Amino acid sequence: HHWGYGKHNGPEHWHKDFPIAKGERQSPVDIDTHTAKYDPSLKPLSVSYDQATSLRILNNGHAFNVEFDDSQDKAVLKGGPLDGTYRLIQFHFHWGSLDGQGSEHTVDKKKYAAELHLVHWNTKYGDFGKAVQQPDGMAVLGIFLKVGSAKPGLQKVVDVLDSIKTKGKSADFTNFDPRGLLPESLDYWTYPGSMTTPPLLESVTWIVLKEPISVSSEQVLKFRKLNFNGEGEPEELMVDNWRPAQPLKLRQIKASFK
Ligand SMILES: [Zn+2]
């Protein structure tokens, strides 16, 4: 068919259809905390999600996406490394088959159980399709998940996963508040990178939060019960849907904090 995360269609194969896979600004990366430098000129992040309008949750065969209404400025990210206004369009996760793997970014080679991506696009380009073709078209807010206490703000997501078990299934998901997925601190690392899935476009300002959120073993277990396959197809559990760390290539990772 096309791309995925298995032995036969996974990250080692992506470069054949998407040669930018071997480019100069690919993501994810390892964040070396000893080499990242505090940038005193970086602003605090402004996460403005009060008017966020969620719509729908969709199993797309790679992950699940929670989609938002991005027709107007309702949920936006501004400040930090960003110029202008980036609209929230969707969030999704990457996760592992085991608690010691699943994040895309790593911190001093440490892998987290999962990683949340809140995906935003630059309103100066008018729509998301145009924005993804621009070097400053996207901003993705990345948050690590470790296994611990349950995250109450995640539970409505966990609750609905039974209803979108297989690829192509969707469900109504209105009135979800993405603010409940955030850790306390908005300290972050930032670097220029790419989409971590095909088409791997080099169009993302990455903003990765220093503080992970804690989720429960039961919560991540339910993510692992999803399927990559469509209904009526042989079951393949949706696990290990992460790309490993890519060469930094002399990009610099900046820290918002001392
Ligand atoms: Zn992602």
Swiss-Prot record:
Q: Which residues carry this modification: Phosphoserine?
A: S163, S170
Q: Name one GO biological process term.
A: angiotensin-activated signaling pathway
The Alpha-carbonic anhydrase domain sits at 1-257
Effect of substituting T196 to A/C/H/P: Strongly reduced activity
Its top-level enzyme class, in one word, is lyase
The record lists the effect of H117 to D/N/Q as:
Reduced activity
**Outcome after substituting A63S:** 2-fold decrease in enzyme efficiency, as determined by kcat/KM ratio, and efficiently inhibited by chlorzolamide
Q: How does activity depend on pH?
A: Optimum pH is 6-8.
Q: What is the effect of changing T196 to S/V?
A: Reduced activity
Q: What is the effect of changing N60T?
A: Reduced activity
Q: Where in the cell is it found?
A: Cytoplasm; Cell membrane
Consequence the record notes for mutating A63F: Reduced activity
Q: Which effect does the record note for changing N60V?
A: Reduced activity
Q: Which GO terms describe its cellular component?
A: apical part of cell; cytoplasm; cytosol; extracellular exosome; myelin sheath; plasma membrane
Which one of the record's GO molecular function terms can you name?
zinc ion binding
Q: What does this protein do?
A: Catalyzes the reversible hydration of carbon dioxide. Can also hydrate cyanamide to urea. Stimulates the chloride-bicarbonate exchange activity of SLC26A6. Essential for bone resorption and osteoclast differentiation. Involved in the regulation of fluid secretion into the anterior chamber of the eye. Contributes to intracellular pH regulation in the duodenal upper villous epithelium during proton-coupled peptide absorption.
Protein name per the record? Carbonic anhydrase 2
Q: Output the lineage of the source organism.
A: Eukaryota, Metazoa, Chordata, Craniata, Vertebrata
> What gene name is given for the protein in this entry?
CA2
